[PDB]
Known about the structure:
The PDB classes it as translation. Keywords: eukaryotic translation initiation, ribosome, eIF3 peripheral subunits, cryo-EM, translation. This is part of a larger assembly, with chains A, B, C, D, E and F. By secondary structure, chain B is mostly loops. Chain B has a single domain (1-84), classed as Single Sheet (N-terminal domain of TfIIb), CATH 2.20.25.100. Helices cover 0% and strands 10% of the residues of chain B. Chain E has one domain (1-136): CATH 3.30.420.80. The longest helix of chain E is centred in the middle third of the chain and has 16 residues, at 56-71. The interface between C and E is medium-sized, with 30 and 33 residues. Chain A binds one RNA strand through strand 6 and helix 4.
Amino acid sequence: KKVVDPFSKKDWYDVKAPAMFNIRNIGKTLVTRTQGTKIASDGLKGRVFEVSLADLQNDEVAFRKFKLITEDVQGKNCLTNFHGMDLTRDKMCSMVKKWQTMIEAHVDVKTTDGYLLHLFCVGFTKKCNNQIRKTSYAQHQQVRQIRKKMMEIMTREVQTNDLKEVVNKLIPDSIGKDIEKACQSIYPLHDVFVRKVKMLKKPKFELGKLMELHG
Amino acid sequence: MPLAKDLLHPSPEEEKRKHKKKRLVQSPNSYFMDVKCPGCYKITTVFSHAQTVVLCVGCSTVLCQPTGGKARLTEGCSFRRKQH
Amino acid sequence: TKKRRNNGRAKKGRGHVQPIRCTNCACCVPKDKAIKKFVIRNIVEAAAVRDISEVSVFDAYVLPKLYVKLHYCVSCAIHSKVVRNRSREARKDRTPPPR
Amino acid sequence: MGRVRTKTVKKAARVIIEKYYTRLGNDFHTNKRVCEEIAIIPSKKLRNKIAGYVTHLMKRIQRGPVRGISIKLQEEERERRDNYVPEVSALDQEIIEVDPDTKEMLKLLDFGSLSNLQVTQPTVGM
Amino acid sequence: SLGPQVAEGENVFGVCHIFASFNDTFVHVTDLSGKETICRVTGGMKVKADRDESSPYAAMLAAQDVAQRCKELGITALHIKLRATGGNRTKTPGPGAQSALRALARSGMKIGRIEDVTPIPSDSTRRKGGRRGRRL
Amino acid sequence: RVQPIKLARVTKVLGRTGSQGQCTQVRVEFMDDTSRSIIRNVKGPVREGDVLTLLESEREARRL
RNA sequence: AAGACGGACCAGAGCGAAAGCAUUUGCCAAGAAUGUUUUCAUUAAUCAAGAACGAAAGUCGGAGGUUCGAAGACGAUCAGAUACCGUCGUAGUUCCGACCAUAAACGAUGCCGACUGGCGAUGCGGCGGCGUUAUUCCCAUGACCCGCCGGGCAGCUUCCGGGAAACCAAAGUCUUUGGGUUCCGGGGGGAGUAUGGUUGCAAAGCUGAAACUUAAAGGAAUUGACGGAAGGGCACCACCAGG
């Protein structure tokens, strides 16, 4: 019954990523016009774009996703900020495999900036280099202490440094690598990755930083 | 076993590998030893499975550390049972 | 007399277990007295993929897989031939069909 | 499809091939006549099936002995051919590396040799 | 509105957002954020039959019809988000999902990545149906 | 919806499927394209090297 | 926001008397195994009464009801459906203090000790190596490999021995009959019914007959026949394409 013809009233915007990447023009998206009869500032600056980090960076990965949130719109350019990094689903499930020990650690941490982040981690005990066991297991005590190391490093390196630098570290997983090394004395481990980051509280008083990141 | 053996004087490697109360002549293999160790200036007698640490006047603390099995020792040491 | 020694998969050294459900018949069955089946399959399968690989551009990425851990109840698992009747001699083997 | 050979034919064929090897040819027509001479076969269709299979056998046979059948003369020839000498036994192999326990086996037999030492990356062969 | 600056001379990317259930397969492409559509043609739309909404032909027809209108608005490329039923339910995609992908690929949409986005819980809450249930 | 008519020539008769055994699998070289080569089921008796006139590659014809 | 739930990882793997028990971290006390020329010096084995715990549903009073859902009411399918199947949804699921005391509470196998047989795993502890890898300057760590020894869940293969067999290193050491102790059975039905007592708010739980009926009730293996159970073939008395 009831239709409208609405693709004649929409305006085009160029979604801009930070200048902390080599590809800044993610692509374009059309939103409804913001005006006093039909309101769309809500539907424009509430936008969260789920983009693959490979397309955003110019490449290193072809898994991984960044959530980009519009923190302001300036002249049909929409300036995005970090909201989270996940590993999609495919990558994450492929790490989880039978006959191993799945180690989970999660932490809640305040950054130098205003932002509260919940950062989940994952790790796996390896099949080592002369092992004739199929399965990889250890005492409960071990795994518990491995988790404490994991949690401590992850909090310490995110507590320090601004949100962007935290991001820049977590892409090559230098935090990850430090965990692997500190745990290597116990069980060597294979993997160690941040599997989810959930932005819990996002305040804006950092239009300064927002402009600094772009350009 | 090939099921017809009779052993009246059994070898001490198939009687010395077994559990302490499962031995065919039962005496444990535990012993005492003299520990010299250099930060201690006296010759402290110590029990092979000491349990709780042995300490001495001559050392600050360096003599034993506890372990559930054989007691841990530090630096130069000797052992002679002697005669169990 | 016992027609299955393990009773379709054992629960020895364990006093009770929680029940899992069937993924296509939804009925309660013990988790380790029922069929458990890993399903790793391509996202674009053997179907879509032929035109999806040719049409793709600006891409270099090996295909995702969907991972789902199915659980089937006995009556459904026999029916749709996940497992099927076998010789009584053959039952004493824990060795299953290779994947 | 149809009219696969029966046991009666094959048995007779084995018989004939072994004892009349030199006489037999490889041509159906001549072999058919030879089967009249060396046997009494009460039907021509039966004799033809026998003769037929015997040519097929002779063809395989004259590449050396083949599956399920052998002729005595060919057996003698293979026997003689196999005089094969693959060592002479010890090579000699004296004073080479041997396992550390195989070493004590030689040692307490009044020999000894050079011997392997050290264990690196066990499990062994892995 | 029309295209961005040209309707076919640049690659503008959106998200496919295919919900594969059984007894339907919704194709329903959206703008990269997710907060505005682009086309709304269901698997029941081209052929409504109440059982052919997930049979390959309907799915094909629909995905081609979507792909048309997509490249008419300057969206000439797509990152694919396949999705199953999800939740504490069957979480298996229907058979009209593969045919739809192949159909839009053929039509003239261009592909750039493929990711999985299926939502799987820890078996939060409870599953539908009683204990004896359907017996097969 | 619509595609152009494709002539495709029988490369290899794969074998017979069907419940009654009266459907024959065939692989047809797409003829226009040597890159494509796709499996379509033929109802009739098939002699290799004869030519089908495919009106679709939609609605894939397959074992049953 | 509410209420619920902790996948994949998770196994003939662990722990707990059993019932039972998987998100992170901390606290509280408890238990086993192991090591042990420590201590006591027979303190022990097993069991009427008596006592502790005890899934699920139900019942008492609240919280709570997201999810799903005994009843009810609806749509189909069936000759019949009141069922399975779709929908709506009640008590209930969840949580707290009380009841209740049973489950195929199944390993259908009392508990304790001794003796009798091969081989390889694995959770865990300890011990040993001119073994590997790993960290601090190397270590002492730890994971791993090999060997050894305990106590776990099991497996495998065996004229070890049993059994009616199926099976079973115990269901073995039973006519060559006897280590300790406890419990229950004496053809099948009537019947966990009758009856009295007892416990429970209730629902229910425990003890527990007879008349009469009847030469089979039952177990196991074997062979056939049959299956809308699973792998197969073959035929125009079958189908196909068709006349």
